[PDB]
Design a protein around this ligand. Structure first.
Ligand SMILES: CC(C)C[C@H](C(=O)NO)C(=O)N[C@@H](CC(=O)O)C(=O)NCc1ccccc1
Ligand SMILES: [Ca+2]
Ligand SMILES: [Ca+2]
Ligand SMILES: [Zn+2]
Ligand SMILES: [Zn+2]
Length: 158
């Protein structure tokens, strides 16, 4: 079971999507990390350049990691489990319609999901869990981590 042996982790948004403003992209990512932060001992710090533990980027089709995106819809994003280098990093399919709304696909929800993987969780079979394999929109204002996911991170760290 890979896990980070450190609690203050850094992240870097290497690039953006034109769909949303840069403040909106940064807010989606910030709040997505807060979710896990309030149920665990992890603290996330944003760096603007440099080698962060978790890199966040928007890429298209082939992007040098042997797991290419597939265009609009289908696979939305992917993350790597805790570890060195590529470990912990998260990529979003630049070919998607990324939103701030109920319209497909909400960057905050997808981000929150990916970060679970970046922290070491696997997919849940509970349809109400964030770590459930398929995307579903849920209200995001005042969003809080479903109980199955809390169980999940707590079982890893504490
Ligand atoms: C390539 C594998 C790793 C699948 C990938 C994934 O789980 N990202 O971690 C993914 O793109 N899953 C899609 C599945 C789909 O087409 O619906 C998804 O919606 N991921 C994001 C998601 C899942 C559950 C809740 C919120 C967001
Ligand atoms: Ca896709
Ligand atoms: Ca990394
Ligand atoms: Zn990738
Ligand atoms: Zn997933």
């Amino acid at each position: 079971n890979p896990k980070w042996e450190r609690t203050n982790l850094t992240y870097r948004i290497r690039n953006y999507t034109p769909q949303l403003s840069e403040a909106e992209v940064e807010r989606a990512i910030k709040d997505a990390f807060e979710l896990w932060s309030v149920a665990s001992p992890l603290i996330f710090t944003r760096i603007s350049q440099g080698e962060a533990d978790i890199n966040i980027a928007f890429y298209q089709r082939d992007h040098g990691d042997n797991s290419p995106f597939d265009g609009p819809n289908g696979i939305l994003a992917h993350a790597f489990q805790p570890g060195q280098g590529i470990g912990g990093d998260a990529h979003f399919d630049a070919e998607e319609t990324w939103t701030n709304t109920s319209a497909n696909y909400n960057l905050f929800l997808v981000a929150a999901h990916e970060f679970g993987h970046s922290l070491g969780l696997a997919h849940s079979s509970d349809p109400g869990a964030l770590m459930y394999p398929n995307y579903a929109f849920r209200e995001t204002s005042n969003y809080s981590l479903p109980q199955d996911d809390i169980d999940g991170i707590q079982a890893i760290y504490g």
